[PDB]
Structures are given as C-alpha cells and as structure tokens.
Amino acid sequence: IRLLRAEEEIELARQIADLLELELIRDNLTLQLERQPSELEWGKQNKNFAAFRRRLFLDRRAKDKMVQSNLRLVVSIAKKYMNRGLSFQDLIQEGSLGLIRAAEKFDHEKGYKFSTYATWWIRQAIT
Amino acid sequence: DQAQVKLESSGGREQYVIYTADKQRFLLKAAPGTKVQNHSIVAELIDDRYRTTTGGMIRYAGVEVAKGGRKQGYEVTKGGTLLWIPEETHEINKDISLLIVEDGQYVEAGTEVVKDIFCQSSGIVEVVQKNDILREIIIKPGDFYQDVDPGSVKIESGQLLQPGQDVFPGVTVSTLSQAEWIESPEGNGLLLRPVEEYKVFDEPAAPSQGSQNEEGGRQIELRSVQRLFYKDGDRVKSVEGAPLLSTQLVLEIYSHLSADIELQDDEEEDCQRLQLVILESLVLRRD
C-alpha cells in the first residue's frame, strides 16, 4: 500500500466525520426503535436507499483507507517498545487499534497533521 | 600561486577558506581528503551580492544556455541583464476555514498571519483554493495603489517600465516595476512590483593555475564556468532567500576513472597553499 498526501487526509477526514455523525444518528435510532434500524435511515428524510448504501460504502472505505495507509507509522513506533514483555506482532496489532481510534477521533479543522495525533494514540495503546 | 588557507571557525562547521590577491574568498564545504572525478564539486565562493529576498519568475531574453538536463547546469558564456520579479509563496495544505485574512488587501511583514503562519514580506495577497483546501498563499511584495478605470495606455504588462514614463496623472514611479491590475472584491486597486536589476560578468576573475612539472603527453587545466539550474519556464517558490548561481569550481581532465585528493604542500613559508594532486601509483615488489 502506498502512502497518502495531505489533501487526501483532509478529504478522508471529512468522509470519516460524515460516517461518524451517520453512526450517531443510527445509534440514537437504535436507542429509540429497540435495535431494528437495519432498514431505517434519516439520511433520506428506491434509488435513495441505493444512494444511501453507496454513501455508507464510500465513507467506510475512506475510514479503512486512512487506517490502512498509516500502518507504517505503527511499525516505526512499535519498534521502540520491543523487549518489555510483548512480542513484535502484539505491539503492532495494539498500535493498530490505537491508530483506528486516532482515525476516528481526528479533527481536520485544526490545521495539524494526522501523524502527531496518531503517534499519541498509538503510543497510548502500546503502553 | 597567491594562496593562503588555514583553519577558521567563527560561525559554523569546519571551514577552510583560501585567500587570493583578487580579494575573492574560495571554499569547499566537503571534507578535506575527498575523491572526485570530472563534473564534480571542487570549490565555491562567497558572494556579497545575489542574496535574494524570496522566490519569483525568471524569463531571460537574449542570452544562451546549453544543457540537456535541468539538474546538471548550463555552462554560461554571455552576460546580459536578466529579470528578477519578487513573489513570495507559501506551499501549505490547510483548510479554507483556517484562513484568517481577506484576499485582496495589504498586510504588513511579520506582524500579519496567513492561516496560523506568520508572514515574511508585506504585499498583495493572492490565494488559490481547489477543493476547500488552501493549496498556496501568494504574497507579492510590492507597493499598492488604488486607482482604476484610467482610459489610457496604463496596461503595459508585456514590456518593462521607464522612470520618464506616464501611466496616470500623478503617479510616482522611479525604480523599474512591472504592472498588472488587481481584480479585488469591491476594490479598485492596481499594484506595482519592484523589479530588481541583475547582471553577471562574461567570465569570472580567477588566476590561471601555473604548472611547474614535466607534463609529457598530458596536462591539467581546469576552467571555472558557473552553472545555471534555472530556466525560463520555471518559477521558484522559495519562502526565503535563494541564490541563482554559485561562483564555484569544476575540474575536468581528458572509460576513464580518476581519484583526486587534496593536501597542503608549501616549502617557501609556514603556510598552506592550493594542492590538488593525482598520480597513478603502481606497485613494484620490493620482496
């Protein structure tokens, strides 16, 4: 997998924020309609449901792309914590979970890059 | 001849600058005892001039350049007066909601801000956004006037400017400046940009390295032709001062391999002179 650029990070962060607010309104609908929201959506309120599925697919693909493109940063960070009790692959997987949290907590309206906030969350998950 | 180089550490790293009777200081920043071949860095020299302000656009007219690759350098022959238009860039990737100043007005150098970034040179702001992302911030450092609709020949964006010219009744113009209008939002401005005059010599002053040896079948004689790595089509986007050329040394000698070292050989006084020696040492067995 190749590495991203900065405008790619801005666009993927916009799509990730769209995905997270859609999941927020989905979670309050599950809290209201007793967990039967698989056929319910507030993004429309036949082709509209296909457009909604396409939008959800592109936002989930944007989140997975922003997570997948930054797995080299996890390997560059987790090579420092090598001999404290875990193996290398466990540190890589836990730092990947921290990178998932950093990708779902990123704010593109601050001007800062993704790598600093990602480094904070990856080191948090490893420790 | 006329060389004097010793150790001198005042501002930075290791620094072995030579002394010449033509009042020109020469230096190579690489380590003493290098291995070089033809078309390499041999020395360079400091410059009192050519300390530019920022980036800009260069379009030379009536001088020849001869190079194939842009990363090699052009062996310049003629001199001539060439262009210099100041234009400061900011190559960033922020958001348009991070933008703090309005486009089309005059800011001040240092005390201003362009999307959480402090300014360097006061001028007219130019902005380009593409996908709600601030791709660049352009600040052309020139004095700004506000007088539009002349009904005259003030549009002269092709040719240069003369101090005895007239573009409007009551416009101060002394230094050479290029003109193009500002399409301001509810504004009637027109900015002039301080074009600076640059010119270089035909061939640089350097004494010819005399040979006191046999020189049977071969001889060493290097020339110092400074290289151009700028062209017409490129515009430079430096946020700070960047030199155009370097007064530098290149050694050529006539596949072929060569390994040249440097030392300090002097048997006249207690000093160190310019010494660049080669000898194809064979190894006869003493046994």
Do A6 and B93 count as a contact with CB atoms less than 8 A apart?
Answer: yes
Q: What are phi and psi of B63, to 5 degrees?
A: -135, 145
Distance to chain B for A27, nearest Cα, Å: 29
In angstroms, the separation between the Cα of residue A34 and the nearest Cα of chain B is 39
Give the minimum alpha-carbon distance from B138 to chain A in angstroms, rounded to a whole number. Answer: 18
- DSSP 8-state symbol, A109: G
Inter-chain touch A7–B95, beta carbons under 8 Å: no
Contact A7 B133 (CB under 8 A): yes
Residues contacting residue B199 through CB under 8 Å, at least 6 positions apart: B79, B80, B81, B82
CA distance A119 to B111: 33
The rounded distance, in Å, linking the Cα atoms of A106 and B116 is 19
Mutate to test the interface with A, among B91, B92, B93 (most CBs of A within 10 A): B93
Contact B93, B135 (CB under 8 A): yes
- Residue for token pair 């000898």: B279
Burial B244-268 (b: 16+ CB within 10 A, else e): bbbbbbbbeeeeeeeebebeeeeee
For residue B228, give the 3-state DSSP assignment: strand
CA A57 to chain B, closest CA, distance in angstroms equals: 22
Neighbours of B59 (CB within 10 A): 11
Question: For B123-140, b where at least 16 C-beta lie within 10 A, e where not — what string?
Answer: bbbbbeeeeebbbebbbb
- This entry's atomic model was obtained through cryo-EM
Q: Classify residue A37 by burial, with Cβ atoms within 10 Å: 0-12, 13-18, 19+.
A: middle
Q: What is the number of other CB atoms lying within 10 angstroms of the CB of residue B78? A: 10
Q: Which residues of B touch A6 (CB under 8 A)?
A: 93
Indicate the resolution in Å. Answer: 3.0
Closest CA to B85 of B157, B134, B154: B157
Q: Which of B97, B157, B90, B181 is CA-nearest to residue B127? A: B90
**What phi-psi label fits residue B54: left (phi over 0), alpha (psi between -120 and 50 degrees) or beta?**
beta
* Rounded Cα–Cα distance for residues B191 and B157 (Å): 12
Residue B154 has a CB neighbour count (10 Å cut-off) of 17
Assigned token pair, B29: 């920043």
The pair of structure tokens assigned to B50 is 């050519």
Q: Is A111 close to B98, i.e. CB distance below 8 A?
A: yes
Which residue in B241, B232, B238, B240 sits closest to B82, CA to CA?
B232
> What size, in residues, is chain B?
287
Q: Do B93 and A109 touch (CB under 8 A)?
A: no
* Interface contact A111, partner B, CB < 8 A: yes
How many angstroms separate the first and last alpha carbons of chain B? 41
- Cβ B98–A11 below 8 Å, yes or no? no
The one-letter amino acid at B267: E
